[PDB]
Amino acid sequence: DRVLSLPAVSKNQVLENVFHTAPKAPVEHLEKMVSANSKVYDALNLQSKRVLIWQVKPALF
């Protein structure tokens, strides 16, 4: 019964409790927010190619 004097938990259970959730990368926030603000730029900048200012405010001619 030498095995019963060993730590009973596991190396596997220790790895699943110490690393319970996969950590969030720091570049993930930059990538998500830059791909959203790309849509913000495309919609709401006057130098955009698909600016929404001619759709929401039709120009007077």
Binding site: L30, N45, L46, V51
Partner: protein
Amino acid sequence: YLAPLRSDFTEEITAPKVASASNLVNEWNNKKQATENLMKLLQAYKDIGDAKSEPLLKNHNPRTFEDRDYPVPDFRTQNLKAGDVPKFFDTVISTRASAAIASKDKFWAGRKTEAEAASAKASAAFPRVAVPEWKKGKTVSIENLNTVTDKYAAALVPKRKLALPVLPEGVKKAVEDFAASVGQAKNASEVSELLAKSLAEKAVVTEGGKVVEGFSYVSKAVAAKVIATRRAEVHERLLKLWAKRLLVSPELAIVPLNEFDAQLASKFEGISPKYQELLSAVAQGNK
């Protein structure tokens, strides 16, 4: 943008059907308050763990919460037969591991209660998420989007970093040129490389932008060499242990290591006779 063409008339003069509020500002404000309560909760967790001066990995390690001084059940008492001892061992290991995991869960429940108590009594000033400034009828300037991306990229810089020195092109060509000036033209590669590597070996650690002094860290390479050295010496102890027993009695090699627990029983007369007569018959020797 396409719409169906209804082409029907309205024959009744009724008031228009005003739809109700359809709460999204309330639900998104509840989501924002839930996110900030979670941020306050994580801050309270960090504050309690910093006040107790406790290790980070210790409370998530379930082996911390194992008893290790618990009276272990003797398998010779528990009346098991020949194939039964490994399942008894697995049952004892299971209950000890699950007791350690449940003790960790009880600790984290108490820590959650104390952290929510400290989290309620904390006024929160967190920096907001950097979004581009957009007024109601106005447009969004490219300069503001670039400063918002600058904030996102300033978040990419680590808070404490190794000032890993890249040798600049002017400094490299100056020392490379000096090597040519001495006249050893073909080892200029190695002299500029060894200047870069000698600056890299004593790489310094920065607080934020300023330098922390008296900072010593253990690299992952150094820690892995420590682990490999300790692992090799314990494996050497294991080889010496089995070398002694196989020098005294080599017949132990006819019973495989995984099958051994499947032979045992609580009493000696109940031990499985699959290997007994073969073991005693090999123990006489080669004649």
